[PDB]
Design a protein around this ligand. Structure first.
Ligand code: 3PH
Ligand code: 3PH
Ligand code: 3PH
Ligand code: 3PH
Ligand code: 3PH
Ligand code: 3PH
Ligand SMILES: *[C@@H]1O[C@H](CO)[C@@H](O[C@@H]2O[C@H](CO)[C@@H](O)[C@H](O)[C@H]2NC(C)=O)[C@H](O)[C@H]1NC(C)=O
Ligand SMILES: *[C@@H]1O[C@H](CO)[C@@H](O[C@@H]2O[C@H](CO)[C@@H](O)[C@H](O)[C@H]2NC(C)=O)[C@H](O)[C@H]1NC(C)=O
Ligand SMILES: *[C@@H]1O[C@H](CO)[C@@H](O[C@@H]2O[C@H](CO)[C@@H](O)[C@H](O)[C@H]2NC(C)=O)[C@H](O)[C@H]1NC(C)=O
Ligand SMILES: *[C@@H]1O[C@H](CO)[C@@H](O[C@@H]2O[C@H](CO)[C@@H](O)[C@H](O)[C@H]2NC(C)=O)[C@H](O)[C@H]1NC(C)=O
Ligand code: NAG
Ligand code: NAG
Ligand code: NAG
Ligand code: NAG
Lengths: 573, 145, 573, 97
């Protein structure tokens, strides 16, 4: 029945699709991102997903017990996979906090991101609110109050702290009402995001200069397709969207799906995930192209007005087409007045503005809140879109917390003096308290640091070790015979070669390329805000900052060789 | 004034009469330039005003610039005021019902936007659907009976 | 369960409640109408309704067969009761035609009843559209094109003819889909009218000068409470709203309700009917009072402006409170200029405008279409309200056609060569063809003539003869013993005296009072439009017009003494 | 003009300059009546205009009614124009930008 398809849709659609994918796509060329995305999708989203579902269905055990039985060497992979989800949850909830804040600021008139404040002498608008737009300022200053560097930390604020607290409380309340939320309700939840995205696509396709965004998003230019930092971040974005490495899919299809097909399931999941990502990365980029072309026309109009007011020209003469003709003409009439005015003529082009308009980790927010002020009734659509994002957030949040609660409420050592609600609240409280780093003044930098490495590299390595283990330690022929005898169908050599050969070579090649291009350039530069100019400068990471960058991937991936040693000291006696 | 602006209306001193006479002089200049192809320097002292009443009311006539015995006919002044009425209105914040030139009537505002019987279209679609359901029902009740 | 209550609500709410009741209430003093309405309600809406339901449940036969068995004298009461409904259906469908037309004219901008046309010289608006309002003109001229008298008939128009044809076709289609329309659908149909009435009450209570309408509607003045033409038309309005006389309620609770209570049923029905009528006669009168106070303020403003422009006065001096002071002051300053201007000073008062503002049989239309132009988005509410009225119309129409179809599809003489659909369509076509009198130029006058007498007097007499028969020809004691033995409950002496004594005396007294006040004044005057002045003048009925006035009640009530004679010639042999 | 009115803008002949000088004279009259409590009959010939450019641009100063050597200071003219700017705007259909 259609219930299976709608449950699958609910499974797939998350936050890596409507929030993370556009931020990654804009950052790495746009056009030069889908090609690597589709490549990594077909080569590592079909085979490893199906392999993981098949193992979870075959062993019918938890995330840790399965790899415990496959070999005594490989027990710690479950511990690492659980630590990964633990790292995920904390910074993950901040995205729900932000949507909470934006939602609370939607019951006003006018909306605070639609106008700029006034200066002290009440003549014009604020100086910072003019360099940036009305929305970039509201994001970087009103809801974040970012510092111009990483060393100027400051102190914990009180508004984002409260929003994050409320987010943790509401996820607590949703988890206390049983570890189930669907049933006769999937038809509404799985459909609302699609409906709101259709609405916003209708709105954003009727904006002047929209085709520029789609052109920038689809058409690839072969100069950053040779960037290794694009391939790896495209593959691990897939790894992050499907849920690999988190040990959730293994434990899901373990006490479920007795003899149903795993191939059809994995294929539908991967297809709907990629389709939602590609469809959501278009409604954003139409509005992005609109913003870029608007800023470009503004550059042009400002320069034209300066030239008109300076010498003297009939208003409306120098518009946008004779600009170069008149620029040249004002070199044989009176260059004495022109030369000393040259350092003020702004040189603006559309490409340089499509490249850097709203780039950053708040792209989804700034862009979506930018297409609300240009709407008929703004508060309604703002409330609707932000409630949609909150639903997606609570969904992905409960789905990620399942992978950390269940491998804890089953061990018969810790479940003695602590009941279910108590330990759930304890984990929630520790997470809420550790997530207070991201409510400081330089908290967005720490959020960005915690996002990429901790969410990507560990899981990329763990799925690799999982595949190596299932292929060359348990026996490929043994497994295919087992699955034939269990399900009654033989897997094609297509998947048989994808499991063994292509993925475990591609992942290692992608890792060594990125590690080499890290070793041949040196230290890496992240970003900044530069409130005094209104653009993202690229300041360097401090030395103490690289410490946490190392420690994250270490403490989330070095749990394998310590399990392989604890299982070696116990095998001595 | 009170009808048009409410409790936001200015008071009508003699500087307002100065501005009114200058507006009428400007209108006469424009009409004689754009229609008669002549350039005549009407001033505010060539607009003669009489019978000033407190309900804002007066008569005026116009004289050639320096020939006091030369009165521009009433018809040409009516034309010159028709040509520039929307500007004299704006100078005072009045709207053609608060600034009445008795004898000069505004004659605009034609409505146009219907291409036919917009209602006939819905009537026809509903009638089509209804007759189709009717024949379906007759056929069903006939062949099944 | 609540299904019974909702089915009862669907039973009660019709068109005599939302269309006919306000038109009658405004016509007869307003305040001096509810008092007679409630009196006649309590004295003739409880007892006769319960008696009719009880007889229909006791005999378990049709409308004609029951009175056939009660006595051979009384067979023709069913024929008369059927002829009544036949007379009803034809002019009844015109009300659905009009709502159809108004609905079709709701997909425009601006709506045609919201502005006036222009004159020939394009200086101002139309002359007739200014005397009347923008809505009275659109009703009397655009959708009706009424003639200034009854003798100027003219020819059948083609727009209202088409609307009436479509109405008959759609009622045909609804009747061809089985003689049942409810079931799991009552919760929506029975609720939509009340929701839309709540909406319009919310809108109409926030209009300046609304309390005047409610004051005029509720507060009675004792000078027209002595008008006999108010009592009779208030009692027979009840008779028309509950469905008495039509023989539909007898045939309804005949093959149904085995041993359930009839008292509770009749009480709920009467209460919800009267409640619906009184609640709907308030949303209209709030807007009516608004219209009246607006027209009064317009009179005052026009007179003030004339006085100001005439002599000379500072604009804004003579407003509405010093009007009499200044009127008197301008008699000791220069009466030489005042006297010759006296025949132009309009004398306007609020009472004389509340008495005659929108009076007529299109009151519901003109008033409701007047509170749409004063709304935020007009087309939406217009479409909603007119679709509501169309639902009510089709409902009451099918309910009235049931009483004419079923006593025809059962007689085993005519059902030989004509199947069900064929005879249904034949009656529908004959009705559609006879209802073409009401699409002429003087068609509204014929509609008004056919409405009152044919819908009221026959049924008022038939329920009287029904009660006399059931009380003094079948035996009161026999019937009460039968009902006690059948249902197991004794009826109180309350209903026992209401059946026998109070109603058969009150109806005859009300009839002789009205017939006397017809004989002591002479001929009656109906109304006219007087397009050249913009108010309803009261021209006389022509002599040939009284012919149909007589023939209607004759041919719909004189079927009793011919049955009593046909049953006398057969009892001779 | 083209920035404010679009393809609905009038052309700026010397009758428009006449109306501008009359507006400035009216503003000066009003300021000297309502603030200085004096009645001075400024005219359109007391507003001296210079440097007329085709991008609509000029300088102006104001002189006492019949004393050509008496120039009203720039500060009082600024005050008189602040007091009546919303009216000079309306006379030309312009909007302070
Ligand atoms: C946020 C971080 C998340 C942390 C979540 C991790 C939770 C599990 C951590 C441990 C997983 C690593 C496996 C290491 C092997 C255990 C060591 C050992 O057996 O001691 C040898 C131990 C002897 O070691 P010795 O100290 O060297 O002599 O053998 C024993 O005699 C211990 C007696 C066993 C008592 C039974 C207790 C039952 C609870 C066990 C279940 C816990 C595993 C959870 C797996 C769930 C699948 C069903
Ligand atoms: C948004 C982030 C925050 C969200 C909200 C988080 C807040 C939730 C945290 C809740 C923490 C407390 C949970 C309450 C659970 C129910 C309370 C209850 O039922 O109490 C009954 C009751 C509470 O006291 P009462 O007022 O007398 O009812 O406690 C008892 O009387 C039972 C006797 C307790 C015996 C103590 C001995 C236990 C240990 C034995 C020796 C070993 C020591 C090791 C201890 C283990 C600790 C790790
Ligand atoms: C555009 C959105 C997606 C479009 C696709 C719509 C949905 C497709 C449904 C999938 C069809 C499978 C139905 C069930 C049958 C299972 C398939 C199966 O048996 O596989 C084993 C099948 C068995 O073959 P054997 O080697 O003979 O055993 O393996 C194959 O040989 C098929 C290989 C096809 C490779 C995938 C298709 C594309 C590869 C070529 C390069 C693609 C360029 C990427 C650019 C894309 C741009 C958008
Ligand atoms: C829009 C107008 C609506 C019109 C709807 C009215 C439909 C019914 C009209 C007749 C009602 C008045 C009753 C008059 C008594 C009938 C006259 C008579 O019996 O002839 C004497 C007749 C002798 O009369 P003679 O001509 O004087 O000798 O007796 C017979 O021998 C006739 C043989 C009877 C044949 C059986 C036919 C079965 C159909 C009868 C059912 C019709 C009544 C419908 C009632 C439904 C309740 C179940
Ligand atoms: C909006 C208002 C208007 C709404 C729409 C109203 C329009 C509906 C009106 C419909 C009128 C026709 C109904 C059609 C019914 C089905 C047609 C059909 O099945 O025909 C099969 C068929 C039609 O011809 P076909 O083309 O050969 O199929 O007719 C036959 O072949 C059957 C043979 C007929 C025998 C004739 C003898 C019957 C009478 C015997 C002597 C007595 C004479 C008295 C006649 C009684 C008349 C009162
Ligand atoms: C405001 C909207 C309506 C308000 C009423 C809310 C609903 C009322 C539910 C009806 C109560 C009956 C429940 C079931 C019991 C059946 C009644 C029963 O047994 O009757 C036989 C009952 C048996 O009595 P017996 O004579 O001892 O056998 O008859 C009576 O004695 C009751 C007589 C009461 C008359 C009706 C009430 C009003 C009469 C006084 C004048 C009214 C002024 C009208 C102005 C109204 C202004 C709005
Ligand atoms: C806009 O473009 C012009 C020309 O492409 C730039 O002017 C050039 O500046 C370089 C130095 O940076 C000179 O060597 C060239 O001779 C200049 N060109 C000309 C034609 O004079 C200009 O710098 C650009 N705008 C900005 C803001 O840099
Ligand atoms: C002033 O205007 C009058 C007209 O209003 C002129 O009068 C005309 O004078 C010529 C000869 O000078 C006569 O032939 C006309 O018959 C006069 N017209 C009228 C209507 O009387 C007068 O010439 C003008 N004076 C100046 C100095 O321009
Ligand atoms: C308005 O009211 C006035 C006074 O109530 C009416 O004037 C009276 O007219 C009658 C004749 O109809 C005279 O006999 C009275 O002497 C008049 N009264 C006064 C005070 O002069 C007037 O007719 C009313 N308006 C209209 C239109 O009839
Ligand atoms: C014209 O205005 C000037 C000022 O601009 C007046 O000049 C003043 O004259 C008096 C004596 O007449 C001197 O004491 C002042 O010093 C002069 N002021 C300046 C600034 O020079 C002049 O009087 C005015 N003339 C008339 C006729 O009013
Ligand atoms: C604008 O404000 C600044 C201080 O914020 C002040 O120094 C300056 O004088 C103001 N501008 C004017 C024209 O007064
Ligand atoms: C641009 O300037 C040229 C003169 O160099 C002129 O001929 C042309 O009309 C201008 N274009 C527009 C659109 O005004
Ligand atoms: C108004 O129209 C009528 C004819 O409808 C015409 O006789 C009259 O002259 C017009 N008014 C004016 C001022 O021309
Ligand atoms: C009405 O007129 C009187 C003079 O008769 C005046 O005193 C009063 O202020 C006026 N009322 C209003 C509201 O203007």
């Amino acid at each position: 029945s259609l219930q299976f398809v709608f449950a699958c849709i609910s499974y797939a659609v998350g936050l890596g699709n409507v929030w993370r994918f556009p931020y990654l796509c804009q950052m790495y060329g746009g056009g030069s991102f889908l090609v690597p995305y589709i490549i990594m999708l077909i080569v590592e989203g079909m085979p490893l997903l199906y392999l993981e579902l098949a193992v979870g269905q075959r062993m019918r055990q938890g995330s840790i017990g399965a790899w415990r039985t496959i070999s005594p060497y490989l027990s710690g992979v479950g511990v690492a996979s659980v630590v990964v989800s633990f790292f995920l949850s904390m910074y993950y909830n901040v995205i729900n906090a932000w949507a909470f804040w934006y939602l609370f600021h939607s019951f006003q008139d006018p909306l605070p991101w639609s106008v700029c404040p006034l200066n002290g002498n009440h003549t014009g608008y604020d100086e910072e609110c003019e360099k940036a737009s009305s929305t970039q300022y509201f994001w970087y200053r009103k809801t974040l109050n970012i510092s111009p560097s990483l060393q100027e930390n400051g102190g914990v604020q009180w508004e984002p702290a409260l929003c994050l607290l409320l987010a943790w409380l509401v996820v607590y309340l949703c988890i206390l009402r049983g570890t189930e939320s669907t049933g006769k309700v999937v038809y509404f939840t799985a459909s609302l995001p699609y409906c709101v995205l259709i609405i916003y696509l209708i709105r954003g396709l009727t904006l002047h200069g929209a085709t520029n965004g789609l052109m920038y998003m689809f058409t690839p230019k072969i100069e950053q397709l040779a960037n290794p930092k694009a391939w790896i971040n495209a593959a691990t974005q897939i790894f992050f969207s499907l849920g690999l490495g988190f040990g959730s899919l293994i434990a899901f299809a373990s006490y479920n799906e007795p003899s149903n097909n795993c191939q059809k399931h994995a294929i539908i999941v991967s297809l709907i995930n990629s389709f939602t990502s590609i469809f959501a990365s278009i409604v954003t980029f139409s509005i992005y192209g609109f913003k870029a072309t608007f800023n470009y026309e503004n550059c042009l109009k400002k320069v034209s007005l300066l030239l008109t007011n300076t010498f003297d020209l009939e208003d409306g003469f120098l518009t946008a087409s004779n600009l170069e003709q008149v620029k040249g003409y004002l070199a044989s009439a009176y260059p004495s007045k022109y030369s000393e005015m040259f350092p003020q003529i702004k040189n603006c082009s559309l490409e340089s503005e499509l490249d850097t308009a709203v780039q950053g980790t708040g792209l989804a927010f700034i862009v979506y809140t930018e297409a609300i002020k240009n709407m008929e009734v703004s508060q309604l659509w703002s409330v609707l879109y932000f409630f949609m994002l909150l639903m997606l957030g609570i969904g992905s949040m409960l789905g990620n917390t399942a992978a950390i609660l269940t491998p804890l409420t089953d061990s018969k050592i810790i479940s003695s003096h602590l009941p279910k609600e108590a330990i759930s609240g304890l984990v929630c409280l520790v997470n809420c308290a550790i997530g207070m780093v991201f409510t400081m003044e330089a908290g967005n930098y720490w959020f960005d640091i915690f996002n990429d490495y901790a969410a990507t590299l560990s899981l990329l390595l763990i799925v690799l070790v999982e595949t190596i283990a299932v292929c060359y330690v348990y026996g490929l022929r043994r497994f295919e015979s087992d699955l034939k005898a269990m399900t009654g169908r033989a897997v094609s050599w297509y998947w048989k070669v994808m499991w063994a050969g292509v993925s475990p070579l591609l992942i290692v090649s992608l890792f060594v390329f990125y590690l080499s291009d890290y070793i041949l350039t040196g230290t890496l530069k992240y970003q900044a805000w530069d409130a005094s100019q209104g653009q993202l400068v690229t300041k360097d990471y401090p030395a103490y900052a690289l410490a946490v960058i190392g420690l994250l991937v270490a403490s989330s991936t070095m749990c394998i060789p310590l399990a392989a040693l604890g299982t070696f000291v116990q095998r001595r006696l | 004034l009170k009808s048009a602006l409410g409790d936001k209306a200015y008071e009508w001193n003699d500087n307002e009469m100065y501005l009114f006479r200058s507006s009428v002089a400007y209108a006469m200049r424009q009409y004689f330039l754009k229609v008669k192809n002549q350039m005549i320097l009407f001033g505010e002292e060539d607009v003669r005003v009489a019978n000033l009443k407190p309900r804002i009311s007066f008569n005026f006539f116009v004289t050639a610039p320096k020939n006091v015995s030369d009165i521009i006919p009433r018809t040409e002044v009516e034309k010159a005021i028709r040509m520039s009425r929307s500007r004299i209105n704006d100078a005072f914040r009045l709207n053609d019902n608060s600034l009445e030139f008795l004898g000069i009537q505004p004659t605009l505002g034609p409505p146009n936007q219907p291409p036919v019987s917009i209602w006939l279209i819905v009537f026809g679609v509903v009638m089509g659907v209804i007759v189709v359901g009717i024949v379906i029902l007759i056929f069903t009740g006939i062949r099944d009976r």
